[PDB]
Design an enzyme around this catalytic site. Structure first.
Site, PDB file in Angstrom:
ATOM      1  N   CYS A 197       0.796  -1.239   0.000  1.00 52.26           N
ATOM      2  CA  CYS A 197       0.000   0.000   0.000  1.00 52.26           C
ATOM      3  C   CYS A 197       0.819   1.275   0.000  1.00 52.26           C
ATOM      4  O   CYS A 197       1.523   1.575   0.961  1.00 52.26           O
ATOM      5  CB  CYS A 197      -0.963   0.057   1.176  1.00 52.26           C
ATOM      6  SG  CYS A 197      -1.952   1.504   1.218  1.00 52.26           S
ATOM      7  N   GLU A 243      -4.292   3.576 -11.591  1.00 50.78           N
ATOM      8  CA  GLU A 243      -5.029   2.320 -11.458  1.00 50.78           C
ATOM      9  C   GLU A 243      -6.099   2.206 -12.546  1.00 50.78           C
ATOM     10  O   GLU A 243      -6.302   1.137 -13.130  1.00 50.78           O
ATOM     11  CB  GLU A 243      -5.720   2.252 -10.098  1.00 50.78           C
ATOM     12  CG  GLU A 243      -4.813   2.458  -8.893  1.00 50.78           C
ATOM     13  CD  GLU A 243      -5.545   2.182  -7.605  1.00 50.78           C
ATOM     14  OE1 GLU A 243      -5.870   1.000  -7.361  1.00 50.78           O
ATOM     15  OE2 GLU A 243      -5.814   3.135  -6.841  1.00 50.78           O
ATOM     16  N   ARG A 277      -0.144   4.529   2.819  1.00 51.19           N
ATOM     17  CA  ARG A 277       0.015   4.363   4.263  1.00 51.19           C
ATOM     18  C   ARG A 277       0.300   5.592   5.122  1.00 51.19           C
ATOM     19  O   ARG A 277       0.341   5.486   6.345  1.00 51.19           O
ATOM     20  CB  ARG A 277       1.016   3.252   4.584  1.00 51.19           C
ATOM     21  CG  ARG A 277       0.475   1.841   4.388  1.00 51.19           C
ATOM     22  CD  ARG A 277       1.571   0.819   4.622  1.00 51.19           C
ATOM     23  NE  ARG A 277       2.493   0.725   3.493  1.00 51.19           N
ATOM     24  CZ  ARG A 277       3.666   0.104   3.557  1.00 51.19           C
ATOM     25  NH1 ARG A 277       4.040  -0.465   4.695  1.00 51.19           N
ATOM     26  NH2 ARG A 277       4.431  -0.009   2.476  1.00 51.19           N
ATOM     27  N   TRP A 304      -8.863   5.626  -1.243  1.00 52.05           N
ATOM     28  CA  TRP A 304      -9.283   6.351  -2.446  1.00 52.05           C
ATOM     29  C   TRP A 304      -8.376   5.963  -3.610  1.00 52.05           C
ATOM     30  O   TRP A 304      -7.348   5.305  -3.424  1.00 52.05           O
ATOM     31  CB  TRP A 304      -9.353   7.878  -2.250  1.00 52.05           C
ATOM     32  CG  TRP A 304      -8.123   8.542  -1.705  1.00 52.05           C
ATOM     33  CD1 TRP A 304      -6.954   8.784  -2.364  1.00 52.05           C
ATOM     34  CD2 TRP A 304      -7.979   9.124  -0.405  1.00 52.05           C
ATOM     35  NE1 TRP A 304      -6.094   9.492  -1.552  1.00 52.05           N
ATOM     36  CE2 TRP A 304      -6.698   9.711  -0.346  1.00 52.05           C
ATOM     37  CE3 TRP A 304      -8.816   9.209   0.720  1.00 52.05           C
ATOM     38  CZ2 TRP A 304      -6.226  10.372   0.791  1.00 52.05           C
ATOM     39  CZ3 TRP A 304      -8.348   9.870   1.854  1.00 52.05           C
ATOM     40  CH2 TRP A 304      -7.061  10.443   1.878  1.00 52.05           C
TER      41      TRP A 304
HETATM   42  C1  HEM Z   1      -6.116   6.520   2.124  1.00 48.62           C
HETATM   43  C2  HEM Z   1      -6.259   5.975   0.878  1.00 48.62           C
HETATM   44  C3  HEM Z   1      -5.554   4.887   0.407  1.00 48.62           C
HETATM   45  C4  HEM Z   1      -4.922   4.898  -0.781  1.00 48.62           C
HETATM   46  C5  HEM Z   1      -4.789   6.107  -1.708  1.00 48.62           C
HETATM   47  C6  HEM Z   1      -4.454   3.575  -1.018  1.00 48.62           C
HETATM   48  C7  HEM Z   1      -3.903   3.162  -2.214  1.00 48.62           C
HETATM   49  C8  HEM Z   1      -3.543   1.848  -2.504  1.00 48.62           C
HETATM   50  C9  HEM Z   1      -3.074   1.415  -3.793  1.00 48.62           C
HETATM   51  C10 HEM Z   1      -2.851   2.291  -5.029  1.00 48.62           C
HETATM   52  C11 HEM Z   1      -2.863   0.071  -3.721  1.00 48.62           C
HETATM   53  C12 HEM Z   1      -2.490  -0.863  -4.883  1.00 48.62           C
HETATM   54  C13 HEM Z   1      -3.754  -1.454  -5.526  1.00 48.62           C
HETATM   55  C14 HEM Z   1      -3.475  -2.492  -6.609  1.00 48.62           C
HETATM   56  O1  HEM Z   1      -2.550  -2.295  -7.420  1.00 48.62           O
HETATM   57  O2  HEM Z   1      -4.201  -3.513  -6.661  1.00 48.62           O
HETATM   58  C15 HEM Z   1      -3.177  -0.321  -2.368  1.00 48.62           C
HETATM   59  C16 HEM Z   1      -3.020  -1.607  -1.855  1.00 48.62           C
HETATM   60  C17 HEM Z   1      -3.338  -1.995  -0.543  1.00 48.62           C
HETATM   61  N1  HEM Z   1      -3.880  -1.171   0.415  1.00 48.62           N
HETATM   62 FE1  HEM Z   1      -4.003   0.880   0.394  1.00 48.62          FE
HETATM   63  N2  HEM Z   1      -4.759   2.728   0.057  1.00 48.62           N
HETATM   64  C18 HEM Z   1      -5.477   3.534   0.936  1.00 48.62           C
HETATM   65  C19 HEM Z   1      -6.082   3.029   2.094  1.00 48.62           C
HETATM   66  C20 HEM Z   1      -5.986   1.732   2.599  1.00 48.62           C
HETATM   67  C21 HEM Z   1      -6.681   1.263   3.754  1.00 48.62           C
HETATM   68  C22 HEM Z   1      -7.682   2.086   4.581  1.00 48.62           C
HETATM   69  C23 HEM Z   1      -6.254  -0.031   3.944  1.00 48.62           C
HETATM   70  C24 HEM Z   1      -6.638  -0.938   4.937  1.00 48.62           C
HETATM   71  C25 HEM Z   1      -7.131  -0.695   6.227  1.00 48.62           C
HETATM   72  C26 HEM Z   1      -5.326  -0.333   2.884  1.00 48.62           C
HETATM   73  C27 HEM Z   1      -4.800  -1.586   2.630  1.00 48.62           C
HETATM   74  C28 HEM Z   1      -4.121  -1.981   1.495  1.00 48.62           C
HETATM   75  C29 HEM Z   1      -3.695  -3.305   1.212  1.00 48.62           C
HETATM   76  C30 HEM Z   1      -3.732  -4.522   2.131  1.00 48.62           C
HETATM   77  C31 HEM Z   1      -3.234  -3.321  -0.037  1.00 48.62           C
HETATM   78  C32 HEM Z   1      -2.843  -4.557  -0.816  1.00 48.62           C
HETATM   79  C33 HEM Z   1      -4.068  -5.067  -1.584  1.00 48.62           C
HETATM   80  C34 HEM Z   1      -3.744  -6.217  -2.518  1.00 48.62           C
HETATM   81  O3  HEM Z   1      -2.761  -6.940  -2.254  1.00 48.62           O
HETATM   82  O4  HEM Z   1      -4.461  -6.395  -3.525  1.00 48.62           O
HETATM   83  N3  HEM Z   1      -5.166   0.744   2.049  1.00 48.62           N
HETATM   84  N4  HEM Z   1      -3.620   0.769  -1.637  1.00 48.62           N
HETATM   85  N1  LIG Z   2      -7.003  -6.903 -11.495  1.00 52.75           N
HETATM   86  C1  LIG Z   2      -8.278  -6.310 -11.917  1.00 52.75           C
HETATM   87  C2  LIG Z   2      -8.793  -5.313 -10.912  1.00 52.75           C
HETATM   88  C3  LIG Z   2      -8.349  -5.407  -9.574  1.00 52.75           C
HETATM   89  C4  LIG Z   2      -8.829  -4.484  -8.637  1.00 52.75           C
HETATM   90  C5  LIG Z   2      -9.746  -3.480  -9.057  1.00 52.75           C
HETATM   91  C6  LIG Z   2     -10.244  -2.540  -8.049  1.00 52.75           C
HETATM   92  O1  LIG Z   2     -11.454  -2.448  -7.826  1.00 52.75           O
HETATM   93  N2  LIG Z   2      -9.334  -1.768  -7.345  1.00 52.75           N
HETATM   94  C7  LIG Z   2      -7.849  -1.746  -7.513  1.00 52.75           C
HETATM   95  C8  LIG Z   2      -7.157  -2.092  -6.183  1.00 52.75           C
HETATM   96  C9  LIG Z   2      -7.616  -1.163  -5.094  1.00 52.75           C
HETATM   97  C10 LIG Z   2      -9.166  -1.321  -4.985  1.00 52.75           C
HETATM   98  C11 LIG Z   2      -9.814  -0.863  -6.311  1.00 52.75           C
HETATM   99  N3  LIG Z   2      -7.284   0.246  -5.270  1.00 52.75           N
HETATM  100  C12 LIG Z   2      -7.144   1.093  -4.209  1.00 52.75           C
HETATM  101  N4  LIG Z   2      -6.901   2.372  -4.449  1.00 52.75           N
HETATM  102  C13 LIG Z   2      -7.364   0.536  -2.808  1.00 52.75           C
HETATM  103  C14 LIG Z   2      -7.487   1.291  -1.637  1.00 52.75           C
HETATM  104  F1  LIG Z   2      -7.813   2.575  -1.751  1.00 52.75           F
HETATM  105  C15 LIG Z   2      -7.288   0.733  -0.368  1.00 52.75           C
HETATM  106  C16 LIG Z   2      -6.953  -0.609  -0.233  1.00 52.75           C
HETATM  107  C17 LIG Z   2      -6.823  -1.396  -1.382  1.00 52.75           C
HETATM  108  C18 LIG Z   2      -7.034  -0.831  -2.652  1.00 52.75           C
HETATM  109  N5  LIG Z   2      -6.930  -1.663  -3.965  1.00 52.75           N
HETATM  110  C19 LIG Z   2     -10.190  -3.387 -10.386  1.00 52.75           C
HETATM  111  C20 LIG Z   2      -9.706  -4.318 -11.328  1.00 52.75           C
END
Ligand code: HEM
Ligand SMILES: NCc1ccc(C(=O)N2CCC3(CC2)N=C(N)c2c(F)cccc2N3)cc1
Ligand code: HEM
Ligand SMILES: NCc1ccc(C(=O)N2CCC3(CC2)N=C(N)c2c(F)cccc2N3)cc1
Ligand SMILES: C[C@H](O)[C@H](O)[C@H]1CNc2nc(N)[nH]c(=O)c2N1
Ligand SMILES: C[C@H](O)[C@H](O)[C@H]1CNc2nc(N)[nH]c(=O)c2N1
Lengths: 417, 417
Positions: free
Chosen positions: A114, A291, A117, A286
């Site tokens: 993430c 993405e 963070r 958000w």
């Molecule tokens: C404040 C806004 C936040 C932003 C802008 C953000 C953004 C992101 C982004 C861009 C990714 C990569 C997504 C992908 O490529 O699939 C991600 C992954 C992740 N985020 Fe954050 N995040 C936010 C809040 C959170 C919150 C509130 C949590 C949990 C309490 C969190 C937990 C995670 C986790 C566990 C991943 C890995 C997800 C995976 O492996 O598919 N995030 N986040």
């Molecule tokens: N591989 C196809 C695929 C995977 C995920 C999404 C999707 O809905 N996404 C992308 C990953 C996602 C959540 C929104 N993007 C974020 N900004 C997000 C987040 F804001 C917090 C935690 C995890 C997140 N993961 C769409 C298409």
């Protein structure tokens, strides 16, 4: 004693000591693997062994009370005793609301993949540990979506469902994300909508959901409660905020008829904390522009609009060396950011995000001597070396609390009806 | 039995068996570390122990003869005997020219960080194992540079100097690359030239080299022969081919006064093969546009021309969200490719290169069940997910033969005079 880490853009050096508190994963470096077993926490058919649970519980309680600026020794000791007694008399234990809040934020801090963070301390926690039916799950989820969306001013939130008991009564969201578009295999052989959700879409259809064969049909929630068969619930359209894609200069961009949802929320992960496991804990933050503009719109296995955007820009789409793909993907990214901004919906560009994470990483090493980070996921899908994260050496390790992946529910579920 | 690898862009699956032939590195996954000890092969003060050398020698000889389409059993056995006898009577052994050629190509095939490995079978080998003086090293290097440059039609080549004997008579090129520009700390406090070569430039100056205080002054060769003190040799300007940077549309781009060398060659790596070690073996291929346009020209710790190019394009350089950096870096990449092409100098854009490596990887798994690959280095510094390599899971492991990094010579060298 500590691992040396170097940022090649500033020359700065950092000493990582936090990795010692890792839980060890064992093993042909598998860094580029998306879903490795080390990041997955599977199902169970029996309760957690007390000899394993108790030590973890103690560890967590110590971490919780150890986080206070002004220690509360008596409370600490009392809680340690109460937990032990509860574990002996019930076979498990219940976290206090404050402990759960701390756990959810710590697990977020511990998410190596993430980039957002820096916001770790700003998180709304919805306690749904008393939930018992699928209908109640649906209601809790609708409340989460509503609070988080906040009419475009996106707020981070997480809804915690009942923890795993024996492993046969797990609360699970079958969806990978709360909001996602359907994918259909049309009669003429063409694919319509999100090609990546073909299988899950078919699953919803098999469960009674009515397919609408559109390009952007919001998938229904497939909810599993108390280990029972999953029930389908359509998401009320009024709760789904969307952004229509427009380009600040290319008036023809709108002709593409593109749009996307404002709420990015993961729904199939498991929260691990103090020996406990919560198989259902949807959370959201958000969006980061790339993405949508790069992965959703430009991946070949997704909406794949790259070539179409190339032609419309009048580029040499038949000559890779012209770098037409680079030019096109950027205008798409510009469209995404422009549209979200114009429609007053929270979003961050990848540059600002990257600098944001660098600041956070700096804060983490100062605060606790480390920050688990997966470089492969932290570097954006475009303009990699233009961001500071690219030049930052990072250490990727699994701590506790932690958000794990899970085995796809439809592969391990035992059907009743 | 085998590790499962998946390409998320095509769904294709691959089974890696080659990783079993890895040499194991032991150990908080350190994937993003630039120069880890596992990829470094340090100095010695005594010959290689026979109990260690012989087994490796046998292993290599078996690999060599095992590569022939039509086995030559008698030759194989004879060579095995000759090597053993040579090791017992001399304490080491000499590779035949054909074995060295095979070794250099295999080590290239085994380079996880090289995206141009599809060309692995096309390599010119210069045998300089009889070299004895620094002057002779200089001559060999000049010949290498001349052959490789080939008036713009770049050719891959490697020059193999005498192998390490006892470790006190090592042949070493102190330069990181054969062709590189100097970096100067000017009197007014500003940096001139390549800021990344400040220290090495000062070293050359300390060794008698005359500083020219220019933006693109080609550094001299600092050569160490037979373990003796390094001697400085200026590279004959007629041998250094350069490309002046121009943009196909922006006539003002030329006003930037930028240029770069056509020959990309690493000069400080060590070739490991059959128990032997060659501390001096400069090799080269050809450029990929992003190296210059993105890393050399846009890294902040290098030439850092990003902002200047931004203003000249009339972009909102004071608003990160405008994505001005994305737009600028691309025009720079376009300039690099355009200039090299116009001046008939070999170069490849990152898209073509990426597809090229994917084909190679496919060939490798079919030919030998694997291909060591470092994702972090294989994905370009711009438009990452636009390339297929980004969506390809990869396994990174160290085989043999292999090209290792070395401890900086000036840190371990024992000065005579
Ligand atoms: C404040 C806004 C936040 C932003 C802008 C953000 C953004 C992101 C982004 C861009 C990714 C990569 C997504 C992908 O490529 O699939 C991600 C992954 C992740 N985020 Fe954050 N995040 C936010 C809040 C959170 C919150 C509130 C949590 C949990 C309490 C969190 C937990 C995670 C986790 C566990 C991943 C890995 C997800 C995976 O492996 O598919 N995030 N986040
Ligand atoms: N591989 C196809 C695929 C995977 C995920 C999404 C999707 O809905 N996404 C992308 C990953 C996602 C959540 C929104 N993007 C974020 N900004 C997000 C987040 F804001 C917090 C935690 C995890 C997140 N993961 C769409 C298409
Ligand atoms: C045919 C042309 C070739 C091309 C286009 C090519 C391209 C590249 C590129 C782009 C890199 C990354 C450079 C960096 O980011 O620092 C690289 C690394 C590497 N290449 Fe190739 N290469 C070619 C030939 C060769 C040859 C002939 C050898 C050796 C016999 C070789 C050995 C390596 C090694 C060992 C690395 C890693 C260097 C390091 O760690 O700094 N390459 N190559
Ligand atoms: N970190 C500052 C820096 C590093 C290397 C070079 C340089 O001269 N380079 C970049 C790496 C290089 C050789 C040319 N680029 C190649 N295309 C190349 C090659 F063609 C074969 C083997 C190794 C290579 N590596 C310039 C600046
Ligand atoms: C194979 C590779 O791990 C995969 O394509 C990756 C890499 N980088 C990523 N980084 C992020 N943030 N999200 C992703 O889905 C991926 N996928
Ligand atoms: C910290 C990180 O490993 C470093 O910045 C990298 C990453 N990717 C790279 N990839 C290539 N090809 N070349 C490089 O120099 C680097 N540097």
């Amino acid at each position: 004693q500590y691992v040396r880490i170097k940022n090649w853009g500033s020359g700065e050096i950092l000493h990582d000591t936090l990795h010692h508190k890792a839980t060890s994963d064992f093993t042909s470096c598998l860094g580029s693997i998306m879903n490795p077993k080390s990041l997955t926490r599977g199902p169970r058919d029996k309760p957690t062994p007390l000899e394993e649970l108790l030590p973890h519980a103690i560890e967590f309680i110590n971490q919780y009370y150890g986080s206070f600026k002004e220690a509360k020794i008596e409370e600490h000791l009392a809680r340690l005793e109460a937990v032990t007694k509860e574990i002996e008399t019930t076979g498990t234990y219940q976290l206090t609301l404050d402990e759960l809040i701390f756990a959810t934020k710590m697990a977020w801090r511990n998410a190596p993949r993430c980039i957002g963070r820096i916001q770790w301390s700003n998180l709304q926690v919805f306690d749904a540990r008393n939930c018992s039916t699928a209908q109640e799950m649906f209601q809790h989820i609708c409340r989460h979506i509503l609070y988080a969306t906040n009419n475009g001013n996106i707020r981070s939130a997480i809804t915690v469902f009942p923890q795993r008991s024996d492993g046969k009564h797990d609360f699970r969201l079958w969806n990978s994300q709360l909001i996602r578009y359907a994918g259909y295999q049309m009669p003429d052989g063409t694919i319509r909508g999100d090609a990546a959700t073909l299988e899950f879409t078919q699953l919803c259809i098999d469960l009674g959901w009515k397919p609408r064969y559109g390009r952007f049909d919001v998938l229904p929630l497939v909810l599993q409660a108390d280990g029972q068969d999953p029930e389908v619930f359509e998401i009320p359209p009024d709760l789904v905020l969307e952004v229509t894609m427009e380009h600040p200069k290319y008036e023809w961009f709108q002709e593409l008829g593109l749009k996307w949802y404002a709420l990015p929320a993961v729904a199939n992960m498991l929260l691990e904390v103090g020996g406990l496991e919560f198989p259902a804990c949807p959370f959201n933050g958000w969006y980061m522009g790339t993405e949508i503009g790069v992965r959703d719109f430009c991946d070949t296995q997704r909406y794949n609009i790259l070539e179409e955007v190339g032609r419309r820009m009048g580029l040499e789409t038949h000559t890779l060396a012209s770098l037409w793909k680079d030019r096109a993907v950027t205008e798409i990214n510009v469209a995404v950011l422009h549209s979200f901004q114009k429609q007053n919906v929270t979003i961050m560009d990848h540059h600002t995000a990257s600098e944001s994470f660098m600041k956070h990483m700096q804060n983490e090493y100062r605060a606790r001597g480390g920050c688990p980070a997966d470089w492969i996921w932290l570097v954006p899908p475009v303009s990699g070396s233009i961001t500071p994260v690219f030049h930052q050496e990072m250490l990727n390790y699994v701590l506790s609390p932690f958000y794990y992946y899970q085995i796809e529910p439809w592969k391990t579920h035992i059907w009743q009806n």
